[PDB]
Amino acid sequence: SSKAASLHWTGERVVSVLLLGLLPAAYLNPCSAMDYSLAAALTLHGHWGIGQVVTDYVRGDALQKAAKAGLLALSAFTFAGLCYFNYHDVGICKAVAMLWKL
């Protein structure tokens, strides 16, 4: 027996408390690094969350594997996109500040 399921569940809350720690950390300290860690925490926590919805509603054998594959695609493309936006544009924190004072 490996304690996988439970370890996963633990990670979920670690990132949940990590993401809570970042929304005030972003506002109080907007920077290069924060932009990435925010993107990282954002894309994982969402990936697992949707995963939890899928492995709840998406009933079946073939479709369960499908949804999970297409979700890994959406995630990969999401994290990478947000990283591109950081490196080549203003960076999440600055984008927020701009979008806002408007």
Binding site: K3, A5, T55, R59
Partner: protein, 239 residues
């Protein structure tokens, strides 16, 4: 005279074509007992005897008469009819289960799930049993209060929306709370491998603390809370 309407789910598996619908009944409350079971039994004995349902203790301790009364899962002999004659009582079978006939659900899966958690004491040394009473301090015994009182209604799990969509692979609160009941029984030597049986996505982990179980419990028990303790234990238990 004081009349109360009763809208009840109906299905005869023995009349062809006939599919699910509600039937309305009318009962004088001066001639009827205060509980909804009393009502059911009365219409069964006086009006229509096709009305088929489960019953026994009429005391709310056997869990036979579990059903969904007015959009919530309780016991018909414990729920009292709302003396309000301006409402119509909607009586339904325990939600999202196979209707065998009328208000009678197929609980065999529910039970089979109970079986798979092994609800009995397990000693690493069954070689000395039946000859000496096992020692357990009143403190260690208090940990069972609020757990051992479960009647196995199926009000519980049949209110959990995870158990609606995943009832086949997700054990649901009733069953789960009992597994907990055997983890914290200080006399049980199998506390660890009892957790290993839940190490997969569905057994325990379909719970999302929706809290419809605790809310719906006819006995005032708290399966949801007990579940949370399992979840904690699962994340903390060694080896």
């Amino acid at each position: 005279p004081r009349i109360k309407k009763f809208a009840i789910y109906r299905w005869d598996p023995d009349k062809t074509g006939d599919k699910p619908h509600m039937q309305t009944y009318e009962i004088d409350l001066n001639n009827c007992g205060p509980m909804v079971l009393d009502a059911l039994i009365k219409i069964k004995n006086e009006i229509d005897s096709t009305l088929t349902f489960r019953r026994s203790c009429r005391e709310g301790i056997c869990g036979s008469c579990a059903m969904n009364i007015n959009g919530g899962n309780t016991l018909a002999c414990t729920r009292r009819i709302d003396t309000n004659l301006d409402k119509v009582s909607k009586i339904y079978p325990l939600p999202h289960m196979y209707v065998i006939k009328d208000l009678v659900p197929d609980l065999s899966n529910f039970y089979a799930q109970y079986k798979s958690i092994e609800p009995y004491l397990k000693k690493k040394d069954e070689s000395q049993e039946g000859k000496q009473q096992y020692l357990q301090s009143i403190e260690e015994r208090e940990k069972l209060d609020g757990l051992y009182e479960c009647i196995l209604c199926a009000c519980c799990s049949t209110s959990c929306p995870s158990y609606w969509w995943n009832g086949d692979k997700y054990l649901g609160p009733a069953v789960l709370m009992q597994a907990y009941r055997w983890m914290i029984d200080s006399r049980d030597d199998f506390t660890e491998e009892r957790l290993a049986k839940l190490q997969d996505p569905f057994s325990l982990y379909r719970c999302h603390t929706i809290m419809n179980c605790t809310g719906t419990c006819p006995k005032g028990l708290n399966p949801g809370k007990a579940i949370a303790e399992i979840k904690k234990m699962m994340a903390t238990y060694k080896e």
